[PDB]
Structure 1
């Protein structure tokens, strides 16, 4: 049976919610034995991803990812790293440990190709500095980049509200204002913590905003993707 391995804890709140999403969007018919098989390494002790870029110590962070990719390679058939920023480490990791990897950047790119309208990348100065989406996506010309100021506001929302487990709807007004400012009805979850916003929007039936949210997509398409 196909096992998904999740390298998460980046952050832990969104990692737990992602595991919840997997079973929410893959409810069984008769027996639980149908449901997704998942291994989650939720290690918050991973060095901060943006923090490792802003200081010297990217080597420390790449080692964390490399060791845990070795573990999950043996245990799982497909692997997801529960942080977009964390994907910056991948050029340094050997090709053999990335065969089973499903890239959050690629999953985003696929959904944006289908959607085919301009979309606001919500991230994370670290993700922006590393240019993961601009360098990774075939659809890069459909990605609207936040200004440096609004990147810092998004960083504040992530760390002050989302990573702390607070109600993701509390930032919805600020997100709507950004969406209006940049003249778009959609966002990309460039930070995985926007999985938490995306879920709260779907729960309240707010369908005015189009969320290109890789973790939602992975959860929804688990049976198709996990081979």
Structure 2
């Protein structure tokens, strides 16, 4: 009966891998009928998120979301947007469409409250420009913001490696480096692509790092979260 709608494609590789996680972390006992009921709107054609801010038409982007939320509100019970940045348009949307919503920022916020140690916000320059975490989280004093320099190095990783579907473990060495620099053993997948990393770490059984990955957190607690 209960159905999740996912407005994704903003990271189509991640979008796919996220759905894969949902069934990985909710494997049925006897019958498939048991398993999670998901709807995925995978639209890569969504106007570039970090590039919609740096041009005149954020107007075009907000429309995209509104249109697709109007659809998903009918077909789903709960709704998730598979892009953190993308949440920046939610001020502009009428409150009725956001009734079913589950903020990736709120999920990250709760996770960080329980973990309760300083944690590095891994996000692109454009994700940071929107200040979604600094405004949105109650646990904001525990968030370590990257330097503008390192935000661009993370922009490289996301777009040049992760988004292109290459092995997430390749960037691991560069991420371990940052973690020592900013002096934590933990990260927030500000940019959703780090769902891909989060998995690859768990797969390798590398427990040295604590990952606050909202998409993992959703997948795992699907049975609870979806009403």
TM-score class, shorter-chain normalisation, is over 0.9
Q: Aligned equivalents of 1:140 and 1:169: distance in 2? A: 28
Give the 3-state SS of the residue equivalent to 1:108 in structure 2: helix
Partner of 1:7: 7
Q: Distance in 2 between matches of 1:56 and 1:214?
A: 31
TM-score of the two chains, using structure 2 as the length reference: 1.00
Instruction: Name the SS of the counterpart of 1:5 in structure 2.
Output: strand
TM-score normalised to structure 1 length: 1.00
Unaligned segments of structure 1, at least 5 residues: none
Secondary structure at the aligned position of 1:92 is classed as coil
Provide the C-alpha distance between the structure 1 equivalents of 2:124 and 2:68, rounded to a whole number of angstroms: 23
Per-residue deviation, 1:204: 0.4
Q: What is the CA-CA distance between 1:3 and the residue it aligns to?
A: 0.3
* Residue 54 (structure 1) shift: 1.2
Measure how far apart 1:127 and its partner are.
1.3
CA distances 1:7-28 after superposition (whole Å, capped 9, x unpaired): 0000100000000000000000
CA distance in 2, matches of 1:127, 1:101: 19
Q: Deviations over 1:173-200 (max 9, x none)?
A: 0000000000000000000000000000
CA shift at 1:55, angstroms? 1.2
Q: How far apart are the structure 2 equivalents of 1:127 and 1:168?
A: 20
Please report how far the alpha carbon of residue 2 of structure 1 lies from its aligned counterpart in structure 2 after TM superposition: 0.4
* Deviation, structure 1 residue 56: 1.6
**Cα distance, 1:134 vs structure 2:** 0.4
Gaps of 5+ in 2: none
Which residue does the alignment assign to 2:81?
Answer: 81
**1:201 shift after superposition:** 0.1
Give the total of aligned pairs.
Answer: 227
Q: Which residue of 2 aligns with 1:21?
A: 21
1:141 maps to 141
Shift of 1:124: 1.2
Query: Could you say what the CA RMSD is over the residues aligned between the two structures, in angstroms?
Result: 0.4
Question: C-alpha deviations, 1:55-81, integer Å up to 9, x for none?
Answer: 121110000000000000000000000
Aligned to 1:164, the other structure's residue is in SS state coil
CA distance in 2, matches of 1:85, 1:55: 16
CA distance in 1, matches of 2:29, 2:164: 35
In the other structure, the counterpart of 2:52 is 52
Which whole-Å CA distance do the structure 2 matches of 1:98 and 1:126 have between them? 23
For 1:56 and 1:120, how far apart are their aligned partners in 2?
31
Task: Give per-residue Cα distances to partners, 1:149-177, cap 9 Å, x unaligned.
Answer: 00000000000000000000000000000
